[model samples]
Target: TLYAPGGYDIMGYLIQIMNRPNPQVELGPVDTSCALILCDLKQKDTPIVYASEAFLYMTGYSNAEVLGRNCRFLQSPDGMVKPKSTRKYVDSNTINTMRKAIDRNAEVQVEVVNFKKNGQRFVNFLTMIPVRDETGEYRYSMGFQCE
Candidate 1:
């Protein structure tokens, strides 16, 4: 099962690949075939689970190094490359739409901006779903990438 922050207080989703990401999103040594994971930004700098190879190549880090890091490291402050201020990936409408999916337990399919290992930014198609636990509390986000 996937975990949170390399195994946080039990938060994160468990999912398998439905297909694959497009070749366009690939940069550096990593190319198409990487699966993007949709994780909750609850704990800072912590990733519960990611497609090992895909994640490593995308972040330009070894499998071990990425095990406990947050995906935000890929997102520059201000939501894009480090700007004159603030930390946040260049805001994307997809993120906002994803929020709606979580708040309403709906599913959203759209394109979004994501980073590559070399700090490259690419637009990619992303599908996000909100999964809940037994009591109906929100859990982690389950997402898959597509062309």
Candidate 2:
């Protein structure tokens, strides 16, 4: 509730999304220590639908700042500058691997160099899994991050 817009019922929506088909991946108990994020693939831009408190703390961003936006904001804060100099923190191969995995609806785990809202850099161990609906259609992506 603290992370989503008013009257949105983000937790309820999350529960419905989690109640999917096989390939069970239990989120366990609610804990702020876990940096979790959910992106809605059904959305036009695959924007983030939910971001945990831990994720907000780690990225130094307010809940409103992250919601309804692509997770790539961490890579390029300005969202416009993608020159080699600005992207030196992360290599091209890692980016390509992640893109391919998402396109194939596969899971990917990688060590990514992410930037905080305050411009500080951190090495984030990120795991992204594509969640499917009852009809075996990809619906969302669950991202777990550890620094």
Candidate 3:
């Protein structure tokens, strides 16, 4: 039940929590112009549960093509390849930075080289923030990307 209404509900709840008041972290309004992706931290592999239309346009991927796949799929032309095996053009340092942040359930921003569905490369200014539910448990990671 990870499609449409179900996924939309999850995003809506996350957005609600994101906009709630927090003295430690003051985030500005959600940037609608940036490409956005929501990854379910509770799910195995941290797969993408929702992708914004801007993200779809930026990567030239259909909604169905990107759903349930790891966001790291954009790091290479072939989405199925292992990280260490064929990450020739991508920077492992940047990837490691993101990985470490995710492991710690923290926020991170990095400029990464990402490939589109057509094999075109783009410099993605990626920002990832961990979203917590009402129980204050890390539930999802919201990714914002700009070229």
Candidate 4:
């Protein structure tokens, strides 16, 4: 792993290059108003990469629970695990569609449903991009959240 101490953007980029198995994950300074929520896209239920304390507070979970559980786990029990909402879209079989799109070196953005740990729901705007290894397999999925 290319450790970039305080560089979230750089390390985020690197995670893409490595296609890290789980979310390479990170925590930004509180003062920066930067809160990042990421996860590994290779696995359908890839756990949360970095659940900022702010995120934990907002999501109602400890870092431990969010860390390795598929981001989908955030789905309140009421939220059905749909392909698009799943972290890597693993169970959806749409990953191939994403791979083809990524092969074009494109950065994609979409808005979809997301669930909180309490089963509370939100419609999230998400950006989907490919962090590929030298061989170009989408080793990792790199993206962040938005309102």
Candidate 5:
């Protein structure tokens, strides 16, 4: 176990906060503009466990479409995947930095071009934080995004 008992409930707490019976109703009043995305690191693909309403709206993807895939679908990596336009790119250096931070349990922020379901590209300012279970074992990652 990475942490002893009663360490913290970052994941649970964050989950509770992210889930609303009606995201539109609950978040609309608060200017709920940020996109909340959760990833299960334990999964082979690090699939999305939850994506805020704002995210769905911004990406033009249904919840079901994004739930079982790695968030990398939005990253237009050169030569790896062909985007409608080659002008948009995610720096390999940023990918490496994010990996190192995940290995070290550190937080990371980066600005990158992200693609929407409609093939629209926008600059996203993203911040990702590793979340641990109460036992201190790393289990997930939470990302907040703004375009």
Candidate 6:
């Protein structure tokens, strides 16, 4: 029932919405509705192309600090900070699952431990899907994260 870059035209719809006369007004809800991150996967390290306000607020980081950084920057060990209870780092299986899912162009969801700027740990529920071009070439991936 679901197809990556097949079941729906991701890029086409993206362009359609972005072509709106008032894109800011139309896409404004994206900033508040979810912690969305648009990534450019063409490079070695998939860089974040866009981050929503909800993401900025959730992570306690400024736009400038997060824009060019790898998403892994947020993964931290719990005892590294004041919270002795949060001792574990992000699971290796979780990272592998994400990579495997992307490689297969299948959607995957995972819950991982992430830290804030001040080293506060929380569970991040994340869903990732590959974004493909009209030719079905992988172009980007979008992550939807919620705490």
TM-score of each: 0.50, 0.73, 0.82, 0.49, 0.70, 0.69
Q: TM-score ranking from best to worst?
A: 3, 2, 5, 6, 1, 4
Compare the candidates by lDDT and give the number of the best one.
3
lDDT of 5 by residue, 1-147 (tens): 122255334446466435534332122222234686877777765667777789889777898777767677787522134323233366777767766776675667788788888778878877776776566677777777778
Q: Flag the better candidate by TM-score, 3 or 4.
A: 3
Error of 3 at 145 (Å): 0.7
Judge candidate 3 against the unseen true structure and give its global Cα lDDT, from 0 to 1. Answer: 0.77
Q: How does residue 64 of candidate 5 score in lDDT? A: 78
lDDT of each: 0.48, 0.71, 0.77, 0.49, 0.65, 0.65
Candidate 3's residue-wise lDDT over 38-122, tens digit each? Answer: 8888888788988889999999999999998888888887655574554776777877888899989877888888889998989
lDDT of 1 by residue, 1-147 (tens): 345445422223332122223322222232235555545534442243544356556445565544445444445422233323343544555555555665575667766566666656766566555545455566555555543
What would the per-residue lDDT of candidate 2 be over residues 12-102, giving only the tens digit for each residue? 4345545545534444443335787888777766678888899999999898988888787787545333423336557888887777887
lDDT of 4 by residue, 36-138 (tens): 4555555544445554555576566677666656554433454345545544323243444444544464555555555666767666555545565456565
- Name the 10 consecutive residues with the lowest summed lDDT in model 5: 22-31
Candidate 6 matches the true fold with a TM-score of 0.69
- The TM-score of predicted model 4 comes to 0.49
Clashes of 6: 1
Model 6 residue 33 lDDT?
54
Any residue pairs clashing in model 3, and if so which?
none
Off by over 4 Å in 5: 1-12, 15-33, 77-88
The most accurate candidate by TM-score is: 3
lDDT of 6 by residue, 68-114 (tens): 55577777732232222232576567877776887675667888888
